[PDB]
Amino acid sequence: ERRAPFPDPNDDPFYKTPSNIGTYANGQVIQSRKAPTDIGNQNGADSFQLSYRTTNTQKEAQANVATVFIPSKPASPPKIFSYQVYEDSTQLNCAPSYSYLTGFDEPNKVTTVLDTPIIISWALQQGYYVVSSDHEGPRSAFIAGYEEGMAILDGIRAFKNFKNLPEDIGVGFYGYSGGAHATAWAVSLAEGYAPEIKIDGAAYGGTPASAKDTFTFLNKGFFAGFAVAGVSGLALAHPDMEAFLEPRLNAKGKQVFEQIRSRGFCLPSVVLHNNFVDVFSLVNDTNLLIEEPIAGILKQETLVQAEASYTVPVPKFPRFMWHALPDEIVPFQPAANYVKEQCQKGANINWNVYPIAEHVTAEIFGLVPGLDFLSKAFKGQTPKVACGSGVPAIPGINSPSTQNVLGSDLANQLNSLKGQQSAFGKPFGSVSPPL
Amino acid sequence: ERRAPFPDPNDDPFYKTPSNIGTYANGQVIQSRKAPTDIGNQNGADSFQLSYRTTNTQKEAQANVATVFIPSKPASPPKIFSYQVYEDSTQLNCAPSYSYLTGFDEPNKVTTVLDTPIIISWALQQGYYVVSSDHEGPRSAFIAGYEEGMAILDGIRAFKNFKNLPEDIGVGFYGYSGGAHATAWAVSLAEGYAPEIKIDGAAYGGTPASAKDTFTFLNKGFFAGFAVAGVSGLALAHPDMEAFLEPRLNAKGKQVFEQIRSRGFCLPSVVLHNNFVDVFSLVNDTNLLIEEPIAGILKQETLVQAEASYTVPVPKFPRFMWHALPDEIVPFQPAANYVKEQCQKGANINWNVYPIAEHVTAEIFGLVPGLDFLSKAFKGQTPKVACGSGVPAIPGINSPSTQNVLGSDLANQLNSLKGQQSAFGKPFGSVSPPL
Ligand SMILES: *[C@@H]1O[C@H](CO)[C@@H](O)[C@H](O)[C@H]1NC(C)=O
Numbered sequence A, B: 001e002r003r004a005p006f007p008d009p010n011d012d013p014f015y016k017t018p019s020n021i022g023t024y025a026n027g028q029v030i031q032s033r034k035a036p037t038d039i040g041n042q043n044g045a046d047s048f049q050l051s052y053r054t055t056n057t058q059k060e061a062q063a064n065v066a067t068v069f070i071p072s073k074p075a076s077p078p079k080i081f082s083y084q085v086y087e088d089s090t091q092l093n094c095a096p097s098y099s100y101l102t103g104f105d106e107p108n109k110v111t112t113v114l115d116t117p118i119i120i121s122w123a124l125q126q127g128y129y130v131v132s133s134d135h136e137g138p139r140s141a142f143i144a145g146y147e148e149g150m151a152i153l154d155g156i157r158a159f160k161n162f163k164n165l166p167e168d169i170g171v172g173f174y175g176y177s178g179g180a181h182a183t184a185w186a187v188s189l190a191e192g193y194a195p196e197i198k199i200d201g202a203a204y205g206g207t208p209a210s211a212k213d214t215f216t217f218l219n220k221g222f223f224a225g226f227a228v229a230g231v232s233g234l235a236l237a238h239p240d241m242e243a244f245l246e247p248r249l250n251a252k253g254k255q256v257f258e259q260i261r262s263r264g265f266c267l268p269s270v271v272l273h274n275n276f277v278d279v280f281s282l283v284n285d286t287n288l289l290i291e292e293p294i295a296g297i298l299k300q301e302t303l304v305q306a307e308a309s310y311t312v313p314v315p316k317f318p319r320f321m322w323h324a325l326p327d328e329i330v331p332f333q334p335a336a337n338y339v340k341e342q343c344q345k346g347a348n349i350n351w352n353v354y355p356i357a358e359h360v361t362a363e364i365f366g367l368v369p370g371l372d373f374l375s376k377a378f379k380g381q382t383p384k385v386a387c388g389s390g391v392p393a394i395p396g397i398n399s400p401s402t403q404n405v406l407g408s409d410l411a412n413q414l415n416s417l418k419g420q421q422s423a424f425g426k427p428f429g430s431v432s433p434p435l
């Protein structure tokens, strides 16, 4: 029954990059302001907006905004929770920060309204400082991982200088669909860009490791419009790719793209549009991708080391990744292949694969677990798992009890075998592996 | 305080193959006898011995024995449980049937005494008819999968004709270490050899898919003696390989092998002997394996389709496989590679990987689960899992509860989102995936 508390981001100057941006240090806040949030209200938690220097893909000084929350009573020691919204849109109004603002009118508000309140409540009901950040930035480039990763790390650095937090503060990433993508890239970059950010863990699911693989799955699909949003975001991130594209737009394609960059064309829009359309149709040249610079930009826009024209980095810290096996929107496979690649390079990836789930459904399944996990990681207690797997069936911890299964006697007999010499010369164990 | 109730198997005629064996049908019992069993006693369950025609590797008519149990009160409908002992020995006294017999003296009795009572009790405390079978057979060939698989299927067919059971009776395999190997081969063969044996499921763990890979891991190891037992068993199974080997035995190797085929040289023996010895030392020719016929026999003695000089078959029915990741005795890797191979050919393999476990310890861990599972499979209720994975974190079913994680409110809010339109145009799901 109330309306937007703020000027639209294009109009608001806060969002505009300053002429002093080059002078401003990375992860340094140019300015800030209080900021009214439905979520921030539900949790009594002061919400703010931080206009902070960052870096774009071309390694250029640009400003950017994040939305931070401060729980009424912080955990000791202090912990930082980072949530990446699946904005999946190429326009500024679609920014998560605008979405966090109150009232029906904001376009991307729906993405914040569903799962996000539940999550950032919990993250605050546990005394973690929250940050969410406009991961596409002024460019508003969807699926542009390098740009998304730098901004999120800069936002945590900004969050830290704004609340004078401890550089050792342990941070906790979260994401799904496009937020997983933005996450997945922020960790991959985190070591190179922001080493001073301790990370107790990070959960994320429904993640597209490769933009090119995702686009191919999306193209000629109901979700093809997301691929058009993808192409447009990548083009905003890579301006030599824009130079390529602009001329090749047939009269249709010129309007497809100025529509998907138009005001109010956010996630809800982007889902209903360009359904079943071949992206290739809008471009004059059918191959499009093979011609440079998109092919080799796509070579850098992937975390799958098979395609990558660079050496994909490998997050060691304990991670938690899920994916609907039949993920009708984000290809399950390149996800698996990142995880596997990353497991032979030695990562701590509790991988959960839902066999009977959609993109939409699986967001909810591994929500509880991903947060349960995210709790433990902060306590330094991430259940120790074979990489690429989950916890295996441990009676009483995650499978039936030794007594419910065998009965009391047989379970007592099994509980005796402890310490006794196996048929192989070694002690037998306990039925519960080590915790 | 009592002694062996039976003549040693070499001496006992029951074990000897008849001259009428060719006339006898496969899985047809030549004869039988009551048979005293510690396990059979503990469970009030009548135990018998079945001398039954089967087939060896060279596709020849040979007799063989199995030990069957009949629970005091069978399940309705009737179900058959098959357990494969890890005899890991090349001598007849080492037979599981001799081990099942009462008294301290039998050599392989220890393998039956540890986990086996617990298991075959449970299998009987649940009203399943039990069969365990001398899977190495008269040849007593350890690690000879084709021979082991045919005998186990023949034993189930024999078990069935002996208790006039229903051909549709649903059978349930179990094994670990060498029993897993014998199992793993009995399923692989089951479709080709015994189609009429319905299988509601099969669990097994610590499984060596490839004899050659296992031997290499074993060689120059404390467990190298098992590799010598392996070579000797393969040689008994493949007599052109014996022809090869006999001459190449240096004076040491002649005595190593007649020792590992000597009476009373069973699993406990085989573990303490030939430790850290290079098998290659005993043979005159260092390569040994590369020269035919061992190389190409090893080409058939593997379930890993990469090596196999044949098209490895793929068990569809719901299976349950585990393996200690650091399995100091059985190489974890060829196990993984079977499972993965078998998952792209479309199998139902709930794969459990223990990250902090030994061969000896992991036998106990996935004992309860493997049986819990084995229960469900009989009820037709094997938890539906992404192949190569386990169940993924499902609150309240195998992970913390939606309320314990988020609290009551946040969990109620999550429980409302059901049926409501996601940010993608589709209903949200429930937090518990489908059961
Ligand atoms: C599309 O137009 C651009 C304009 O420079 C041209 O270079 C390109 O080759 C055209 N593609 C085709 C297939 O005609």
Ligand SMILES: *[C@@H]1O[C@H](CO)[C@@H](O)[C@H](O)[C@H]1NC(C)=O
Pocket (backbone or CB within 6 Å): B247, B248, B284, B285, B286
């Ligand atoms: C070992 O002895 C056999 C006996 O026939 C012979 O053929 C073989 O080549 C010998 N190997 C070596 C390395 O001398």
